[PDB]
C-alpha cells in the first residue's frame, strides 16, 4: 500500500524546475494534456502503435512513451521513464483499468494527482453507496431480490451491455433467461444482479473540482451521456419498436453538453459540498481535484445520483474548449484538464504539493 512519504520522497528527488504532467493516451487525455500545455507544462503521453494518431495530430504531447500494450504501464520500466521525466501522473478511467487498480494502490511508484486511496471507493459499489448515503445524497432505491420488485427497476450485471428493465418479478426472470440463452449472462452474473429503482428524469453528469489549496468545491461543467444502443433504440417509432426483438444496451459512446435550470445550482453545490465533507472523514484527505456526480433529475426537481467518480470523468470531453460554467470564473475557455494543471502549477509555486499528490 503506497505510502505518502513513499511518494513525497520520490517527488523530492525530482527536478522541481522541470516538472511535467503525464497520463495514458485515452479516456480524457486530450484536455488533460492540452490543459497542461496551456498552463506551461511539458506533457508526457503513454501510448502505443495504432492508438497514437489522435495525440500526434492534435499536438498535445511533447514526449511519447510507447508501450506494446497498455497493460505494460504497470511495468517497473515505465514507472522509471516517468520518474526520470519528473512526471506527475494524472489518473483516469482507462489508466486505472489498464494499470490495474491493485497495481495502482501499491505497485505504481509515480507521484499521482489526487487521493490515491479513494480510487477504490469508486470501483466498489458497496463503498460508493456507503459514501453517497452517508454524505446524505439521494440515490435510487435498492432491491435485494427479484421478488422485491414493486415498480419499474433497472438491473445491472458486471458481465459482458449487461442491463435490462423490469416492472415485475415475473418479467425479471423472463428477461434474465432471454439474456442467458442468448449468451450474454451466466448464472453467476444473474446472482450478482444489482436491482434498483428506475429513475425517470433528465441526465446531468455534474463535473466538480475540489481545490485543497482553496478548500472550495467548484462547478466546472455538465454533460448528458450518449449511449448505444439505447439512444438509437428509443429513436425508433414505438410501432416499429414493437415489431422488433431488440434488447437495450447502455454502452457509453459519447457526450452532449447540457446546462441545468439555474435555481437548481444551490442543490448542485450542496451535493458536491456534502460529498466532500463526508469523504474527508471516510477517506482522508478526501476528494482531491475532479469528481463527478452522475445524476437524474426527477419531475420533483430532485437530483438522484446513480453513479459517481472520484477522478476525472469522460464527460469532461464535452467542454474541452471550455463550457458555460467554466467560463464564468475568468471568462476563459477552461477545460477540466486545464483546471487540474493549474492546481498543480499553483501547488508547486506555493510549495503545497503535499496537498494534491499521493
Ligand X SMILES: NC(=O)c1ncn([C@@H]2O[C@H](COP(=O)(O)O)[C@@H](O)[C@H]2O)c1N
Ligand Y SMILES: Nc1ncnc2c1ncn2[C@@H]1O[C@H](COP(=O)(O)OP(=O)(O)CP(=O)(O)O)[C@@H](O)[C@H]1O
Cα 312 from Cα 27, distance rounded (Å): 9
How would you label 32-55 residue by residue, b for 16+ Cβ within 10 Å and e otherwise? bbbbbbbbebbbbbbbbeeebeeb
The yes or no reply on residue 59 touching its own copies (CB under 8 A) is yes
The yes or no reply on residue 237 touching its own copies (CB under 8 A) is yes
Instruction: Considering only residues 307 through 346, tell me which ones interact with ligand X, judged by CB under 6 A.
Output: 313-315, 317
207 is annotated as contributing to ligand binding: no
**Shortest Å, Cβ 343 to its own copies:** 12
Nearer CB in complex with ligand Y: 251/328: 251
- 112 near 99, Cβ under 8 Å? no
Give Cβ neighbours of residue 252 (< 8 Å, ≥ 6 apart). 225, 226, 227, 314
Of these, 92, 116, 207, 225, which contacts ligand Y (CB under 6 A)? 225
Q: Which one of the spans 110-118, 120-128, 130-138, 251-259 is the region binding its own copies (CB under 8 A)?
A: 251-259
Partner that binds at residue 228, options ligand X, ligand Y, its own copies, none, CB closer than 5 to 8 Å by kind: its own copies
The angle subtended at Cα 229 by Cα 223 and Cα 231, nearest 5°, is: 45
Nearer CB in complex with its own copies: 7/176: 176
The yes or no reply on residue 208 touching ligand Y (CB under 6 A) is no
Cα 203 from Cα 230, distance rounded (Å): 14
> Of all residues in this chain, which one has the CB nearest to ligand X in the complex?
314
Torsions phi, psi for 197 (to 5 deg): -45, 130
C-alpha closest to that of 114 among 192, 212, 222: 212
Binding site for Cl ion (CB under 5 A): 93, 207, 290, 292, 312-314
Torsions phi, psi for 88 (to 5 deg): -95, 120
Convert residues 263-302 into a mask of x (bound to ligand Y by CB under 6 A) and - (unbound): ---------------------------------x------
Name the one residue in this structure whose C-alpha cell is 478511467: 93
Convert residues 307-326 into a mask of x (bound to ligand Y by CB under 6 A) and - (unbound): x-------------------
How would you list the strands of the sheet with 63-66, edge to edge?
63-66, 43-47, 20-24, 87-89
- 60 near 42, Cβ under 8 Å? no
Per DSSP, what are the bridge partners of residue 64?
Answer: 45
Nearer CB in complex with ligand X: 27/37: 27
212 is annotated as contributing to ligand binding: no
Partner that binds at residue 37, options Cl ion, its own copies, ligand X, none, CB closer than 5 to 8 Å by kind: its own copies
Instruction: Considering only residues 84 through 143, tell me which ones interact with ligand X, judged by CB under 6 A.
Output: 93-94, 97
The yes or no reply on residue 261 touching ligand X (CB under 6 A) is yes
For the record, the C-alpha cell of 29 comes out as 487525455
Instruction: Considering only residues 279 through 308, tell me which ones interact with its own copies, judged by CB under 8 A.
Output: 296-299, 301
Instruction: Considering only residues 240 through 259, tell me which ones interact with ligand X, judged by CB under 6 A.
Output: 252, 255
Binding residues for ATP: 156-163, 196-199, 227
Binding residues for Mg(2+): 294, 307
Amino acid at each position: 500500500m503506497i505510502s505518502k512519504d513513499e511518494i513525497l520522497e520520490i517527488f523530492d528527488k525530482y527536478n522541481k524546475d522541470e516538472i511535467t504532467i503525464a497520463t495514458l493516451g485515452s479516456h480524457t487525455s486530450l484536455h488533460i494534456l492540452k490543459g497542461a500545455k496551456l498552463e506551461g507544462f511539458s506533457t508526457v503521453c503513454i501510448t502505443m502503435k495504432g492508438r497514437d494518431v489522435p495525440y500526434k495530430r492534435f499536438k498535445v504531447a511533447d514526449k511519447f512513451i510507447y508501450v506494446d500494450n497498455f497493460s505494460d504501464i504497470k511495468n517497473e520500466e515505465i514507472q522509471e521513464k516517468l520518474r526520470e521525466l519528473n512526471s506527475i501522473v494524472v489518473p483516469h478511467g482507462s489508466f486505472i483499468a489498464y494499470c490495474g487498480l491493485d497495481n495502482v494502490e501499491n505497485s505504481f511508484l509515480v507521484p499521482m494527482f489526487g487521493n490515491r486511496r479513494i480510487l477504490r471507493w469508486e470501483s466498489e459499489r458497496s463503498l460508493e453507496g456507503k459514501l453517497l448515503r452517508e454524505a446524505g445524497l439521494r440515490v435510487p432505491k435498492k432491491y435485494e431480490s427479484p421478488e422485491d420488485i414493486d415498480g419499474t427497476v433497472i438491473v445491472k450485471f458486471p458481465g459482458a451491455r449487461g442491463y435490462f428493465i423490469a416492472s415485475s418479478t415475473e418479467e425479471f426472470y423472463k428477461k434474465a433467461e432471454d439474456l442467458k440463452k442468448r449468451g450474454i449472462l451466466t448464472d453467476e452474473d444473474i446472482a450478482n444482479a444489482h436491482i434498483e429503482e428506475y429513475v425517470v428524469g433528465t441526465n446531468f453528469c455534474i463535473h466538480y473540482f475540489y481545490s485543497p489549496l482553496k478548500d472550495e468545491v467548484e462547478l466546472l461543467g455538465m454533460d448528458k451521456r450518449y449511449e448505444s444502443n439505447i439512444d438509437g433504440l428509443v429513436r425508433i417509432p414505438a410501432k416499429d419498436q414493437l415489431e422488433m426483438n431488440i434488447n437495450p444496451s447502455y454502452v457509453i459512446t459519447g457526450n452532449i453538453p447540457v446546462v441545468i435550470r439555474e435555481s437548481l445550482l444551490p442543490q448542485v453545490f450542496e451535493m458536491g459540498d456534502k460529498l466532500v465533507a463526508k469523504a474527508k472523514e471516510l477517506v482522508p484527505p478526501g476528494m482531491i481535484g475532479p469528481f463527478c456526480l452522475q445524476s437524474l433529475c426527477n419531475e420533483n426537481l430532485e437530483l438522484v445520483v446513480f453513479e459517481m467518480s472520484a477522478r476525472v470523468d469522460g464527460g469532461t470531453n464535452s467542454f474541452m474548449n471550455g463550457g458555460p460554467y467554466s467560463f464564468l470564473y475568468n471568462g476563459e475557455p477552461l477545460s477540466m484538464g486545464q483546471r487540474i494543471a493549474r492546481e498543480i502549477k499553483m501547488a508547486l509555486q506555493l510549495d503545497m504539493i503535499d496537498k494534491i499528490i499521493s
